[PDB]
Coordinates of all heavy atoms in Angstrom, one line a residue:
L974 N 176.1 205.9 -81.8 CA 176.6 204.5 -82.2 C 175.8 204.0 -83.4 O 174.6 204.2 -83.5 CB 176.5 203.6 -81.0 CG 177.4 203.9 -79.8 CD1 177.3 202.8 -78.7 CD2 178.8 204.2 -80.1
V975 N 176.5 203.4 -84.3 CA 176.0 202.9 -85.6 C 175.9 201.4 -85.6 O 174.8 200.8 -85.8 CB 176.7 203.5 -86.8 CG1 176.4 202.9 -88.1 CG2 176.5 205.0 -86.8
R976 N 177.0 200.7 -85.4 CA 177.1 199.2 -85.4 C 178.3 198.6 -84.7 O 179.3 199.3 -84.5 CB 177.1 198.6 -86.9 CG 178.3 199.1 -87.7 CD 178.3 198.5 -89.1 NE 179.5 199.0 -89.8 CZ 180.6 198.3 -90.0 NH1 180.6 197.1 -89.7 NH2 181.6 198.8 -90.7
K977 N 178.2 197.4 -84.2 CA 179.3 196.7 -83.5 C 180.3 196.3 -84.5 O 180.0 195.8 -85.6 CB 178.7 195.5 -82.7 CG 179.6 195.1 -81.5 CD 178.9 194.2 -80.6 CE 179.7 194.0 -79.3 NZ 179.0 193.2 -78.3
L978 N 181.6 196.5 -84.2 CA 182.8 196.1 -85.0 C 183.5 194.9 -84.4 O 184.1 194.2 -85.2 CB 183.7 197.3 -85.2 CG 183.3 198.5 -86.0 CD1 184.2 199.7 -85.9 CD2 183.1 198.2 -87.4
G979 N 183.5 194.8 -83.1 CA 184.2 193.7 -82.4 C 184.1 193.8 -80.9 O 183.6 194.8 -80.4
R980 N 184.4 192.7 -80.2 CA 184.3 192.6 -78.7 C 185.5 191.9 -78.1 O 185.9 190.8 -78.6 CB 183.0 191.7 -78.4 CG 182.4 191.8 -77.1 CD 181.2 190.9 -77.0 NE 180.5 191.0 -75.7 CZ 179.5 190.2 -75.3 NH1 179.1 189.3 -76.1 NH2 179.0 190.3 -74.1
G981 N 186.2 192.6 -77.2 CA 187.3 192.2 -76.5 C 187.1 191.8 -75.1 O 185.9 191.9 -74.7
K982 N 188.1 191.3 -74.3 CA 188.0 190.9 -73.0 C 187.3 191.9 -72.1 O 186.3 191.6 -71.4 CB 189.3 190.4 -72.4 CG 189.8 189.0 -73.0 CD 190.8 188.3 -72.1 CE 191.0 186.9 -72.4 NZ 191.8 186.2 -71.5
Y983 N 187.7 193.2 -72.1 CA 187.1 194.3 -71.4 C 186.7 195.5 -72.2 O 186.7 196.6 -71.7 CB 187.9 194.6 -70.2 CG 188.3 193.5 -69.2 CD1 189.7 193.1 -69.1 CD2 187.4 192.8 -68.5 CE1 190.1 192.0 -68.3 CE2 187.7 191.7 -67.7 CZ 189.1 191.3 -67.6 OH 189.5 190.3 -66.8
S984 N 186.4 195.2 -73.5 CA 186.0 196.4 -74.4 C 185.1 195.9 -75.5 O 185.0 194.7 -75.9 CB 187.3 197.0 -75.0 OG 188.0 196.1 -75.9
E985 N 184.3 196.8 -76.1 CA 183.4 196.6 -77.2 C 183.7 197.8 -78.1 O 183.8 198.9 -77.7 CB 182.0 196.6 -76.7 CG 181.6 195.3 -76.0 CD 180.1 195.1 -75.8 OE1 179.2 195.7 -76.4 OE2 179.7 194.2 -74.9
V986 N 183.9 197.5 -79.4 CA 184.2 198.5 -80.4 C 183.1 198.7 -81.3 O 182.5 197.8 -81.9 CB 185.6 198.1 -81.2 CG1 186.0 199.2 -82.1 CG2 186.7 197.8 -80.1
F987 N 182.8 200.0 -81.6 CA 181.7 200.4 -82.5 C 182.1 201.4 -83.5 O 183.0 202.2 -83.3 CB 180.6 201.1 -81.6 CG 179.9 200.1 -80.6 CD1 180.3 200.0 -79.3 CD2 178.7 199.4 -81.0 CE1 179.7 199.1 -78.4 CE2 178.1 198.6 -80.2 CZ 178.6 198.4 -78.9
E988 N 181.4 201.4 -84.6 CA 181.5 202.4 -85.6 C 180.5 203.4 -85.1 O 179.4 203.0 -84.7 CB 181.1 201.8 -87.0 CG 181.3 202.8 -88.1 CD 180.9 202.2 -89.5 OE1 179.7 201.8 -89.7 OE2 181.8 202.2 -90.4
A989 N 180.8 204.7 -85.2 CA 179.9 205.7 -84.8 C 180.0 206.9 -85.7 O 180.8 206.9 -86.6 CB 180.2 206.1 -83.3
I990 N 179.1 207.8 -85.5 CA 179.0 209.0 -86.3 C 179.1 210.2 -85.4 O 178.4 210.3 -84.4 CB 177.9 209.0 -87.3 CG1 178.2 208.1 -88.6 CG2 177.5 210.4 -87.8 CD1 177.0 207.6 -89.5
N991 N 180.0 211.2 -85.7 CA 180.1 212.4 -84.9 C 179.0 213.3 -85.6 O 179.0 213.6 -86.8 CB 181.5 213.0 -85.2 CG 181.8 214.3 -84.3 OD1 180.8 214.9 -83.8 ND2 183.0 214.7 -84.3
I992 N 177.9 213.6 -84.8 CA 176.8 214.3 -85.3 C 177.0 215.8 -85.5 O 176.2 216.5 -86.2 CB 175.5 214.1 -84.4 CG1 175.7 214.5 -82.9 CG2 175.0 212.6 -84.5 CD1 174.5 214.8 -82.1
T993 N 178.2 216.4 -85.0 CA 178.5 217.8 -85.2 C 179.2 218.1 -86.6 O 179.3 219.2 -87.0 CB 179.4 218.3 -84.1 OG1 180.7 217.8 -84.2 CG2 178.8 218.0 -82.7
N994 N 179.7 217.0 -87.3 CA 180.4 217.2 -88.6 C 180.1 216.1 -89.6 O 180.7 216.1 -90.7 CB 181.9 217.4 -88.4 CG 182.5 216.3 -87.6 OD1 182.1 215.1 -87.6 ND2 183.5 216.7 -86.7
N995 N 179.2 215.1 -89.3 CA 178.8 214.0 -90.2 C 180.0 213.1 -90.6 O 180.1 212.5 -91.6 CB 178.0 214.5 -91.4 CG 177.0 213.5 -91.9 OD1 176.9 212.3 -91.5 ND2 176.3 213.9 -92.9
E996 N 181.0 212.9 -89.7 CA 182.2 212.1 -89.9 C 182.1 210.9 -89.0 O 181.8 210.9 -87.9 CB 183.5 212.9 -89.4 CG 184.1 213.7 -90.5 CD 185.4 214.3 -90.2 OE1 185.5 215.2 -89.4 OE2 186.4 213.8 -90.7
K997 N 182.4 209.7 -89.7 CA 182.4 208.4 -89.0 C 183.7 208.4 -88.1 O 184.7 209.0 -88.5 CB 182.5 207.2 -90.0 CG 181.1 206.8 -90.6 CD 181.3 205.6 -91.5 CE 181.5 206.0 -93.0 NZ 182.9 206.4 -93.3
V998 N 183.5 207.7 -87.0 CA 184.6 207.5 -85.9 C 184.5 206.1 -85.5 O 183.5 205.4 -85.7 CB 184.5 208.5 -84.8 CG1 184.7 210.0 -85.2 CG2 183.2 208.4 -84.0
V999 N 185.5 205.7 -84.7 CA 185.5 204.4 -84.1 C 185.4 204.7 -82.6 O 186.1 205.5 -82.1 CB 186.7 203.5 -84.5 CG1 186.9 202.4 -83.5 CG2 186.4 202.9 -85.9
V1000 N 184.5 204.0 -81.8 CA 184.3 204.2 -80.4 C 184.6 202.9 -79.7 O 184.0 201.9 -80.0 CB 182.9 204.8 -80.1 CG1 182.6 204.8 -78.5 CG2 182.7 206.2 -80.6
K1001 N 185.5 203.0 -78.7 CA 185.9 201.8 -77.9 C 185.3 202.0 -76.5 O 185.8 202.9 -75.8 CB 187.4 201.6 -77.9 CG 187.9 200.3 -77.2 CD 189.4 200.5 -76.9 CE 190.1 199.2 -76.6 NZ 191.6 199.4 -76.7
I1002 N 184.3 201.3 -76.2 CA 183.7 201.3 -74.9 C 184.4 200.3 -73.9 O 184.5 199.2 -74.2 CB 182.2 201.1 -75.0 CG1 181.5 202.2 -75.8 CG2 181.5 200.9 -73.6 CD1 180.0 202.0 -76.2
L1003 N 184.9 200.9 -72.8 CA 185.7 200.1 -71.9 C 184.9 199.6 -70.7 O 184.2 200.4 -70.1 CB 187.0 200.9 -71.4 CG 187.8 201.5 -72.5 CD1 188.4 202.8 -72.1 CD2 188.9 200.5 -73.0
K1004 N 185.1 198.4 -70.3 CA 184.5 197.8 -69.0 C 185.5 198.2 -68.0 O 186.7 197.8 -68.0 CB 184.5 196.2 -69.2 CG 183.6 195.7 -70.4 CD 183.5 194.2 -70.3 CE 182.7 193.7 -71.5 NZ 183.6 193.5 -72.7
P1005 N 185.1 199.2 -67.1 CA 186.1 199.8 -66.1 C 186.5 198.8 -65.0 O 186.2 199.1 -63.8 CB 185.5 201.1 -65.7 CG 184.0 200.8 -65.8 CD 183.8 199.9 -66.9
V1006 N 187.3 197.8 -65.3 CA 187.7 196.8 -64.3 C 188.9 197.3 -63.5 O 189.1 196.8 -62.3 CB 187.9 195.3 -64.9 CG1 186.6 194.8 -65.4 CG2 189.0 195.4 -66.0
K1007 N 189.8 198.1 -64.1 CA 191.0 198.7 -63.4 C 191.2 200.1 -64.0 O 191.6 200.3 -65.1 CB 192.2 197.8 -63.6 CG 192.3 196.6 -62.7 CD 193.3 195.6 -63.2 CE 193.0 194.2 -62.6 NZ 193.9 193.2 -63.2
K1008 N 191.1 201.2 -63.1 CA 191.4 202.6 -63.5 C 192.8 202.9 -63.9 O 193.0 203.7 -64.9 CB 191.0 203.5 -62.3 CG 189.6 203.9 -62.2 CD 189.3 204.8 -61.0 CE 187.9 205.4 -61.0 NZ 187.5 205.8 -59.6
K1009 N 193.8 202.3 -63.3 CA 195.2 202.4 -63.6 C 195.5 202.0 -65.1 O 196.2 202.6 -65.7 CB 196.0 201.5 -62.6 CG 197.5 201.9 -62.5 CD 198.3 201.2 -61.4 CE 198.0 201.7 -60.0 NZ 198.9 201.0 -59.0
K1010 N 194.8 200.9 -65.5 CA 194.9 200.3 -66.9 C 194.4 201.3 -67.9 O 195.0 201.5 -69.0 CB 194.2 198.9 -67.0 CG 194.6 198.1 -68.2 CD 193.7 197.0 -68.5 CE 194.1 196.1 -69.6 NZ 193.7 196.7 -70.9

């Protein structure tokens, strides 16, 4: 994880780096309030 991009009702979005190829990615971390969702 590199830096915070935004914060939602049940999610947090980050800019990240894939350490196996030095490529930037976006990571959305979910607050697992409902598995079905």
